[PDB]
Every structure is written in structure tokens, then in C-alpha cells.
Ligand binder design. Structure first.
Ligand SMILES: CNCc1ccc(N2CCCN(C(=O)CCC3CCCC3)C2)cc1
Ligand SMILES: CNCc1ccc(N2CCCN(C(=O)CCC3CCCC3)C2)cc1
Lengths: 191, 191
């Protein structure tokens, strides 16, 4: 509807400017509506960002769910790679939303709780996979699985973000997936 | 001087409130001076934070330098643990400055460049140690050492921060050092 035009306008404008440099008038103009009509679809520009981020986060979540139900016929290293690649490709395809969404964590309770809920879910799933690998004898019982899963997921969040943002320092985007896979596989399977 | 009283006041107030909830008048009062006298020592409350953070960052840097020149007579795992412990104990003893300092990265060019410079230095040193371990045959040649060092240092920054802040999710502070050491040692020495 007009809602999709507002969202697409916001995502396009976030390529160039921070959210503080975008006005409600800018979003309405880009969507072909008046300022009061905008407020019928969203209560604020922050709510537009929250919706964009919610869509990106659930896109990753659903893709990870799909992988879980369709295990790829390949070795263990490639199975972890395909999982991390979900986050690499989903957030990497929406870099401006990812950037603005992490910035809004500091100021928005709703954004911070969205990130935290989905991080908790992904950590719990990671820990359950580690636990399953230990039970079948494929991985050694080293660190508590949930603590290991927490640090590896936090590593991914920080490292992918730095790569996408081109921060200094960062791992080049063309190298970050293999870097993370190496650290995940050695720390999960290494004695 | 009066400068130390301003700094100590700011660090005490940051335990309770964010920097946006602290006024120049608050710092001057706590230091026993007037507002115009404050501006003789610092141009802004942001400059007070920058100085606090610069002191914490150089405290860690100097401690790491000291360790480098006095290698401990212990095994490799404990040597890495003693190095990571520098960051665990230095920033962990100044949690309010660490919290406010990371928040200011978004808004202050000087704060962002302070963090980046010292992260680059620590990554380079980590990579040189990895390279030395590979040359003496103690570590396998897997990932490029500088890429591995980048991701492990970014992991530490994010994971220690979450632990200190009590974020959800996070590794409990009493467990985070052993968690990070495990990931560093397995990813550096694991084939
Ligand atoms: C901040 N940049 C965007 C961003 C990039 C990555 C992440 N991540 C943290 C949450 C889960 N995550 C992961 O590393 C999950 C790996 C999957 C989970 C199960 C098997 C393999 C990536 C979160 C945000
Ligand atoms: C954000 N929380 C405070 C904070 C905590 C940790 C860090 N770190 C990132 C920079 C270097 N760092 C490290 O993990 C360095 C490990 C040392 C370097 C050489 C041998 C072992 C910790 C940076 C900031």
C-alpha cells in the first residue's frame, strides 16, 4: 500500500543520511502523501525504522528456520557456514537498515528488545546444536555450551557489523564469512 | 589539581546517570568550582569523558606493554589468559567510563578515533604473536593472522562490554574470561 512506499522511501534515504537527518516530511514526500496522512500509517520516523528492522530480523529468522528443517548433505564445517551465511546475506543486503537499527538500540527500548529477543533465540539454538554434537560424540565437552554460543553469536554481531560498515578496524566483507566459520568450528570441535 | 576533582566527579556521576543527564554545573559543583572556572580546565562535558576514557585506554595499553616485556613462566593458555585479563580488569574497574565511552563513539569523532587507534594497535600486536607462534611451529597456518586477530579482538570488545553492562544476552562476568580464552586458544592453535 502506501505503507510499503513509506518503508521503501525510508530505506532508500537511510543509504545517504542518518535517521536524525530524515524528517517525517521527507518520508511522506517520497511516498507521495501528506505529513498528516503519514501519521495514519506510522506514529513516528522511529516506528518506520522499527518496522524495517523487524522485517530484516524476521527474514533472517525464517531463513535459519528453513535451514534447520532442511539439513544440507555436506560436512560439518559447511553446515555451520551455511547457517552463518544467513546472517551475512540477510543483514548484508540491508546495510543501511542494519546500521540505523544498531544505532537506535541506544535510544529505543523497542529496538533494543527486538535485538535482544532474537539474539537470545539464536544463542539458544546454537547451544542446542552444540549440545547435540557433544551427545553424539562429535564435539568435546569443553565450555558450557550456552556460554560458548553466547560469545560466538556476539562475535558475529560485532564482526559482521564492522565489516558491513567498513569500520577501521574490520575484516574485509569478502573474507569475514570464512573468518567466522574458522573460529566457530575450531572453538566448537577443538579439544 | 581541580582537574582531578572534575574527573573524579564525572566518573562518580556516570555510575548513576548517562552523560546527557549530567550538566557542566553538576561537574563544577562536585569539584567545588564555578561554571566559568570549569571551562578553564575543560571545554565541555564531552571533553571530560574523552579524558577519562583516554586514561583508561592508556592504562590498559601500558599494562599490556608491561606484560609483553615480562613474559610469565607458564604455559601458552595461561599466557593468553594473562593478556586478555588486562582488558578484563582495566575496563572492568571503570565500567561507567567504559559504558559512556562506547556510547560516545556514535557522536564524537575524537572518541571514535581513540577506540579505533588502540584497537588497531592491539590487533597488530595479536597478529604478530600469532605469526611468531606459527614460525616456531607451535600454531598451524590457517586463517591470515591479521584477520583472525581482528575477529578475536572484536569478540572481546563486544563480549566484555555485554558482560560488564549486564546486557541480555551476556556471559556472566565471573565466566567471561575463561570463555574468551577458550575461543582464542582453540582458534589460534586448532588445525
Ligand atoms: C550487527 N550486524 C548485523 C548482525 C549480524 C549478525 C548477527 N548475528 C548474531 C545473531 C546470530 N548470528 C549468528 O552468528 C548465528 C549463527 C547461526 C545460528 C545457528 C547456526 C549458525 C549472527 C546479528 C546482527
Ligand atoms: C567495550 N568494553 C571494554 C573493552 C574490552 C575489551 C576490549 N578489547 C578489544 C581490544 C583488545 N582486546 C583484546 O582482546 C586484546 C587481547 C590481548 C592482546 C594481545 C594478547 C591478548 C580487548 C576493548 C574494550
Amino acid at each position: 500500500d502506501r505503507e510499503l512506499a513509506i518503508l521503501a522511501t525510508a530505506e532508500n534515504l537511510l543509504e545517504d543520511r542518518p535517521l536524525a537527518d530524515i524528517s517525517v516530511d521527507d518520508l511522506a514526500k517520497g511516498a507521495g502523501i501528506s505529513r498528516p496522512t503519514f501519521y495514519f500509517y506510522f506514529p513516528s520516523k522511529e516506528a518506520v525504522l522499527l518496522t524495517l528492522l523487524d522485517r530484516v530480523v524476521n527474514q533472517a529468522d525464517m531463513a535459519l528456520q528453513t535451514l534447520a528443517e532442511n539439513p544440507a548433505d555436506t560436512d560439518r564445517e559447511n553446515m555451520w557456514r551455511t547457517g552463518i551465511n544467513v546472517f551475512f546475506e540477510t543483514f548484508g543486503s540491508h546495510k543501511a537498515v542494519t546500521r540505523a537499527g544498531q544505532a537506535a538500540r541506544a535510544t529505543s527500548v523497542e529496538v533494543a528488545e527486538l535485538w535482544s529477543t532474537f539474539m537470545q533465540k539464536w544463542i539458544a539454538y546454537t547451544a542446542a546444536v552444540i549440545d547435540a554434537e557433544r551427545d553424539r560424540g562429535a564435539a568435546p565437552r569443553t565450555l558450557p555450551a550456552h556460554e560458548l554460543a553466547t560469545a560466538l553469536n556476539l562475535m558475529n554481531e560485532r564482526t559482521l557489523f564492522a565489516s558491513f560498515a567498513g569500520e577501521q578496524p574490520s575484516v574485509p566483507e569478502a573474507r569475514v564469512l570464512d573468518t567466522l566459520v574458522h573460529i566457530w568450528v575450531t572453538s566448537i570441535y577443538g579439544e
